[PDB]
Amino acid sequence: MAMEDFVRQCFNPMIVELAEKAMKEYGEDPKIETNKFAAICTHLEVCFMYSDFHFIDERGESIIVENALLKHRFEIIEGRDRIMAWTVVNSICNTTGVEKPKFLPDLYDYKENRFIEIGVTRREVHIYYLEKANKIKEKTHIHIFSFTGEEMATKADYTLDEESRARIKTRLFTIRQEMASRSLWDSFRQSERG
Ligand SMILES: O=C(O)/C(O)=C/C(=O)C1(Cc2ccc(Cl)cc2)CCN(CC2CCCCC2)CC1
Ligand SMILES: [Mn+2]
Ligand SMILES: [Mn+2]
């Protein structure tokens, strides 16, 4: 199996289409930078999984419920074009009064009233965390996940319940096991760069 076919069989076609456009528009070919194609899809998938099933009930408390339900706990900013991402961020700042970040985050959490930056790493978790805290310098909460099961989050506050975190980590565990059984893991593990 080529990594390219792996990606197209592993991820939802919606994630794949978004990832393909992002690479071409930035001048990269998903048929050439295949590990980067798989990394883009993975990060996107985790941002969507992170918002999945989370709403805010009548008490303003966080509920899980698995479109038709309109009180979402997170606004998804990743995946949008920059015009619309900045439009959503401004409207959130306009209406909750949080500070406008200088870099685009991945999500807004309406319960804690903060932006969130998500990282998914195959290197030691401190690394992606540092790369991101360097640029945020910083009301933007950071949460990194790894393919080994470790996480690192600002002030050791993981935002989500244990079960949602275990679902993300299970998904990453499966993605690693299936790449490994096809001899793709080693190359993917080595390709991440700072
Ligand atoms: O690094 C992350 O984990 C992450 O979520 C990054 C981002 O959202 C991008 C912006 C960014 C840049 C710096 C920081 Cl600290 C935070 C966000 C980087 C390139 N992204 C687009 C990317 C798609 C593939 C081709 C190259 C550009 C979008 C904005
Ligand atoms: Mn992002
Ligand atoms: Mn991110």
Numbering used by the authors: -1 to 64, 69 to 139, 141 to 197
Wording from the paper:
For influenza, cap-snatching involves the binding of host cell pre-mRNAs via their 5′ cap structure to the PB2 subunit of the polymerase followed by cleavage at nucleotides 10–13 by an endonuclease activity which resides in the PA subunit of the polymerase. Here we describe high resolution X-ray co-crystal structures of the 2009 pandemic H1N1 (pH1N1) PA endonuclease domain with a series of specific inhibitors, including four diketo compounds and a green tea catechin, all of which chelate the two critical manganese ions in the active site of the enzyme.
For R05-02 electron density for the arms is not well-defined in all four copies in the asymmetric unit, although the configuration of the compound is unambiguous and consistent in each copy. The active site cavity of the endonuclease is quite voluminous, presumably because it has to accommodate at least two nucleotides either side of the cleavage site, with the manganese ions at its back. As shown in the superposition of Figure 5A, the metal chelating moiety of the three diketo and EGCG inhibitors binds in a similar orientation to the manganese ions (although compound R05-2 is slightly tilted) but the two ‘arms’ of each compound are inserted into combinations of different active site ‘pockets’, denoted pockets 1 to 4. Compound R05-2, which differs from R05-1 and R05-3 in the point of substitution on the piperidinyl ring occupies pocket 3 and, uniquely, pocket 1. Pocket 1 allows stacking on Phe105 and is uniquely observed with the chlorobenzene of R05-2. In fact, position 20 is an alanine in the pH1N1 strain used in this work and in most recently circulating A strains. These observations can be explained by the fact that the cyclohexane group of R05-2 that stacks on Tyr24 in pocket 3 is also in close proximity to the side-chain of Ala20 which precedes Tyr24 by one turn in helix α2. The absence of such additional stabilising interactions probably explains why the electron density for this arm of R05-2 is generally weak.
